[PDB]
Amino acid sequence: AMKGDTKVINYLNKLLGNELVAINQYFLHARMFKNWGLKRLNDVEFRESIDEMKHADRYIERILFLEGLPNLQDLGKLNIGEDVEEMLRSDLALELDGAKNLREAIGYADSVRDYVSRDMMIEILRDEEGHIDWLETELDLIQKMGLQNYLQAQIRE
Amino acid sequence: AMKGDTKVINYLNKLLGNELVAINQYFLHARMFKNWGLKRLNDVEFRESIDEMKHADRYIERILFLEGLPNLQDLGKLNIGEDVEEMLRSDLALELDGAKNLREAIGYADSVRDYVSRDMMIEILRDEEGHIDWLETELDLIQKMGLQNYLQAQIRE
């Protein structure tokens, strides 16, 4: 029960939009990875899709508590990618943009004394930094090994 | 193991796009309905979101069997709606457009002898016609009763 800040609700709606795109893209990627027998990549991206659902659930709760409603910006084109490196690099691009939006919203919420929205978003950001770190590390390995040597190292004994 | 028809894969990718939008929109709607204490509407839309996930899983399997990859058209703006009638009417709009695309793809797949893709899509269409019928029936009741009388009839004894 409270009427929240207009711009904070706007940020929460932009962020919930990001979650929906990420849930969609990790879903598709996970399934492609499983098809190619890349078990680890499927397991982690499927796991992080669950994190993203949780984030979207938190955003929706908060928007509704602030007496707003879910209302979304255009969610755009998903750049799925055609090979494993392109897939991961496109996930990293979403995550980096999403983290930038989240830091902007944290700063703003903090500035106008919406500390509960701020703190929710801080917890979500810690999760997103984990999502970024995984992707960066895997893409670093693809650079060091070469893509095909990297894919071969995914094959289980 | 087979290289499928280019246009059939294109249809499967357009249809998988529709599933992703529908999964997103039913997700958000379900949560809004639950917040307003509309248990039946939440339960059914949450249930149909599961059907849509299954449809997207079938599309992805088939695209990958046909040696294609998931590759998506712009998924656009979700028109969430601001009241229950607008929400349902926007779901109906997605469903009607999605069914039109599916009948087009069925006709095409049939015409070029891709009977396995055709038959998969026929099963999905039967599900979509059930999704349409629910929405139509509820919107008919909102017209007959008036929205507020309809919402009041959702309140459980």
**Contact (CB, 8 A) for A4 and A114:** yes
Q: List the structure tokens of B114.
A: 């891709």
Q: List the structure tokens of A109.
A: 């919420």
Thinking of the domain A1-157, which architecture would CATH place it in? Up-down Bundle (1.20)
Kindly state the DSSP code that residue A146 receives in the 8-state scheme: -
Only one residue has tokens 């990420």, namely A22
Distance CA B50, CA A157 (A): 35
Helix (H) or strand (E) holding B24: helix B6-35
Distance CA A13, CA A25 (A): 19
End-to-end CA distance of chain A: 56
Q: List the structure tokens of A70.
A: 């879910």
> Which residues in B25-47 are b (16+ Cβ under 10 Å) and which e?
bbbbbbbbbbeeebeebbebbbe
Distance CA A99, CA A105 (A): 10
Distance CA B22, CA B9 (A): 20
A-chain CB neighbours of B52 within 8 Å are none
CA angle A3, B78, B52 (to 5 degrees): 115
Q: List the structure tokens of A32.
A: 């492609």
Query: From residue B16, how far is each of A108, B41, B131 by CA, in Å?
Result: 37, 24, 17
**Contact (CB, 8 A) for A34 and A67:** no
Distance CA A62, CA A55 (A): 11
Q: How many residues does chain B have?
A: 157
- CB–CB of A82 and B73 under 8 A? no
Amino acid making up residue B134: W
**Contact (CB, 8 A) for B85 and B142:** yes
Distance, in angstroms, between B125 CA and closest chain A CA?
A: 22
Say how many CA atoms lie within 13 Å of B61 toward its Cβ: 10
Distance CA A49, CA A27 (A): 7
**Contact (CB, 8 A) for B72 and A74:** no
**Contact (CB, 8 A) for A114 and A7:** no
Cβ neighbours for A144, distance < 8 A, ≥ 6 positions apart = none
Q: How many CB pairs under 8 A join A and B?
A: 62
A-chain CB neighbours of B64 within 8 Å are 31-32, 35
**Contact (CB, 8 A) for B96 and B132:** yes
Resolution reading in Å = 1.4
Distance CA A2, CA B45 (A): 27
Amino acid making up residue B79: N
Nearest to B75 among A64, A70, A75 (CB): A75
- CB–CB of A74 and B72 under 8 A? no
Domain boundaries, chain B: 1-157
Kindly state the DSSP code that residue A94 receives in the 8-state scheme: H
**Contact (CB, 8 A) for B9 and B66:** yes
Helix (H) or strand (E) holding B40: helix B39-65
Distance CA A46, CA A152 (A): 21
Chain breaks in chain A (C to N over 2.5 A) after: none
Distance CA A112, CA A114 (A): 6
Helix (H) or strand (E) holding B135: helix B115-145
Distance CA B47, CA B87 (A): 16
Interface of B with A (CB under 8 A): 20, 23-24, 27-28, 31-32, 35, 56-57, 60, 64, 69-78, 80, 82
A-chain CB neighbours of B69 within 8 Å are 32, 80, 82
Amino acid making up residue A72: L
Nearest CA to B91 out of B155, B31, B28, B14 is that of: B28
